[PDB]
Amino acid sequence: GEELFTGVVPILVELDGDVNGHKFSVSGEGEGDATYGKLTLKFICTTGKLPVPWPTLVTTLVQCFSRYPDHMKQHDFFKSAMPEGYVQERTIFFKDDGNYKTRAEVKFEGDTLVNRIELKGIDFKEDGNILGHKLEYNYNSHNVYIMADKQKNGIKVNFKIRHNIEDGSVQLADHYQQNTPIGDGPVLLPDNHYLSTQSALSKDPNEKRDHMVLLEFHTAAGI
Ligand SMILES: [Mg+2]
């Protein structure tokens, strides 16, 4: 699977969402260079205005582009499942507010890495930080904790995202994640480790549609 990632790979992302009954779609395009753990993508809301803040969708919108150091490469589940791919499922609990449930299939279509997602959000507060659009347009750096889930030939992942609030406070988003292979071939089941992440959000000055431009780095560590 790793041999598929030694150069620059085109990426496509397609999401359909429903948050408290607000339906929307997002399309993204860009490229990944796993040698450097690097992603660059632009996302557009194709149905109009996004009903939630862009930062809340970053984690949902391709961990196969992480840089695994050579001494840890036997622990890279994500690339080992390729090209047939993996199912990535999450529950994201926004503290004092609602939750997202997501199901994604990540796989190659030809030479392009595709991430196709369905997202469902329930129990959000109309005047909370999500539906109230009180989150700053920025993004923090995190540690993503990974363990083997041998009963499903996959992995279990957990981490805390910190979203800055416009009043100086922080909105926590606790992430619970599971990944299972789509194919029935062998995968790399890892020892406990983590991914170190950093991300920068920006806007395309000429773009009038609701959108997000993102630069992200993901690097494995801990063994
Ligand atoms: Mg071991």
Curated annotation (Swiss-Prot):
Changing residue 197 to Y: Gives rise to yellow-emission variants. In EYFP; leads to yellow fluorescence, folds faster and more efficiently at 37 degrees Celsius and has superior solubility and brightness. Changing residue 140 to I: In ECFP; leads to cyan fluorescence, folds faster and more efficiently at 37 degrees Celsius and has superior solubility and brightness. Pfam families: GFP. Contains a chromophore consisting of modified amino acid residues. Maturation of the chromophore requires nothing other than molecular oxygen. Changing residue 142 to D: In Cerulean; leads to improved quantum yield, a higher extinction coefficient and is 2.5-fold brighter than ECFP. It comes from the Eukaryota. The keyword Coiled coil does not apply. GO terms for biological process: bioluminescence; generation of precursor metabolites and energy. Green fluorescent protein has been engineered to produce a vast number of variously colored mutants, fusion proteins, and biosensors. Further generation of mutants led to more stable proteins (at 37 degrees Celsius for example) with brighter fluorescence and longer fluorescence lifetimes. Changing residue 139 to C: In mut1.9; shifts fluorescence lifetime from 3.03 to 2.74 ns. InterPro entries: GFP, GFP-related, Green_fluorescent_prot. Changing residue 143 to K: Increases fluorescence at warmer temperatures such as 37 degrees Celsius. In Esmerald; leads to brighter fluorescence. In VisGreen; leads to brighter fluorescence. The keyword Protein transport does not apply. Changing residue 139 to F: In Sapphire/H9-40; exhibits a huge Stoke's shift, with an excitation peak at 399 nm and an emission peak at 511 nm. In Azurite; shifts the excitation and emission spectra to shorter wavelengths and increases quantum yields compared to BFP. Signal peptide: none annotated. Changing residue 156 to Q: In R10-3; matures to the red-emitting state with excitation and emission maxima at 555 and 585 nm, respectively. Changing residue 170 to A: In mut2.1; shifts fluorescence lifetime from 3.03 to 2.50 ns. Keywords: Chromophore, Luminescence, Photoprotein. Changing residue 144 to I: In Azurite; shifts the excitation and emission spectra to shorter wavelengths and increases quantum yields compared to BFP. Photocytes. Changing residue 216 to G: Suppresses the 399 nm excitation peak, leaving only the longer wavelength peak at 475 nm. Transmembrane segments: none annotated. Belongs to the GFP family. Monomer. Energy-transfer acceptor. Its role is to transduce the blue chemiluminescence of the protein aequorin into green fluorescent light by energy transfer. Fluoresces in vivo upon receiving energy from the Ca(2+)-activated photoprotein aequorin. This is Green fluorescent protein. It comes from Aequorea victoria (Water jellyfish).
